[PDB]
Structure 1
Amino acid sequence: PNITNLCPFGEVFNATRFASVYAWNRKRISNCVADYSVLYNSASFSTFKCYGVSPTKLNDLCFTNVYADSFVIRGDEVRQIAPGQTGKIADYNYKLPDDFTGCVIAWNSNNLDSKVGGNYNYLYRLFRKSNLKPFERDISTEIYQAGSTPCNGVEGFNCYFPLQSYGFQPTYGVGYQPYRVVVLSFELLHAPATVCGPKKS
């Protein structure tokens, strides 16, 4: 029939500020119509790599919920947003499962997220004792203990603050320029699936 109540993709992609990768935003999208062809046919995205599903049948299938995770990483770190990868972002910041169904969308944001003095508002976790579980968020700011001595809450020797700032600048190389990444996770659960694609007339 006639379709209304589109899914809020404007508040995810066109957000005025994005979160840091250590504190990545997760928005649960339910009970609306998700038009994925608007995203796929856009020329503004550099990465639209979908794992476990093809973009052409997204506009047909129907899902119970859609998880939209949004963060900012470097240009060289976009490859680590994939199942089975290894790196600082995958181990310590944002981990994707091997059995992941969804799409990883990334685009360059040197225009917005870089300033001439250096934009240090974006943080990433550099050290953690263990690798993250899939879809885990770590926002702890406790001092990393690399040595046998206790840190006692002070950053001294062998004790480092685990969150380190990015220093985005507009004169940076393409492997260091900021990239806004939105990861959509599609799951089907035994509840009635309500996020369906648009139906042609």
Structure 2
Amino acid sequence: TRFASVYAWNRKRISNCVADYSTFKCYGVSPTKLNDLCFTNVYADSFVIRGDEVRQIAPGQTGKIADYNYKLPDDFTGCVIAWNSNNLDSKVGGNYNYLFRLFRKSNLKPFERDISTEIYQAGSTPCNGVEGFNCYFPLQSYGFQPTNGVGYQPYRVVVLSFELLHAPATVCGP
């Protein structure tokens, strides 16, 4: 239901244990075989997010998200399951509970944490407790009316890679 965010990317270390454990889309490293690829140890980049920006989940992006929160590296390669989550996360009361940041202060690489949560001014205002005249807060809420289409509506967002990792994998046969 809730996910560790892009900064909170979690070691749900889904590996190293004996292997006794929905439309598909394909971009990256050789897909059409299962055992050989390397899933080694997983910090999990996974959250329910917008679906419009799946083209910005791709090499070489530019836009609001790419400029001020996150962009995806030009070497993002992977074949995943592009499928919606309408019936699950298309609410009816109006849902602002999911928080998206508006601007980013440092050019960062993927895969770490930044929790700057001070009362964040984006303008010249010395915001002495009175909002306005270019005053802001770091994180911004979403808002989800009874009818959010696939764009802001979350897919169950498997728009991922099977990223190439370092350690021995854990998927094999006989």
CA separation of 1:54 and 1:35: change in aligned 2, threshold 3 A: farther
The one-character-per-residue Cα deviations of 1:154-189 (angstroms, maximum 9, x if unpaired) are 643212113111112332233232223245555556
CA separation of 1:118 and 1:125: change in aligned 2, threshold 3 A: same
- What number of residue pairs does the alignment pair up? 174
For 1:109-128, list aligned pairs within 5 A: 109-128=85-104
What TM-score, normalized by structure 1, do the two folds share? Answer: 0.64
The one-character-per-residue Cα deviations of 1:29-87 (angstroms, maximum 9, x if unpaired) are 221467999xxxxxxxxx64444313212333344334432112223122222232223
CA separation of 1:168 and 1:184: change in aligned 2, threshold 3 A: same
**5+ long unaligned stretches in structure 2:** none
1:107–1:181 Cα contact (<8 Å) kept: yes
1:168–1:178 Cα contact (<8 Å) kept: no
What TM-score, normalized by structure 2, do the two folds share? Answer: 0.72
**5+ long unaligned stretches in structure 1:** 1-15, 38-46
Structure with more contact order per residue of length (Cα contacts < 8 Å, sep ≥ 6) = 2
Aligned counterparts of 2:14 and 2:74: Cα–Cα separation in 1? 22
Aligned counterparts of 2:92 and 2:123: Cα–Cα separation in 1? 37
Correspondence for 2:58:
82
Correspondence for 2:19:
34
1:119–1:168 Cα contact (<8 Å) kept: yes
Q: How big is the alpha-carbon RMSD for the aligned residues of Structure 1 and Structure 2? A: 3.6
- 1:70 is paired with a residue of what secondary structure? coil
1:81–1:90 Cα contact (<8 Å) kept: no
CA separation of 1:102 and 1:108: change in aligned 2, threshold 3 A: same
Q: Which has the higher strand share?
A: 1
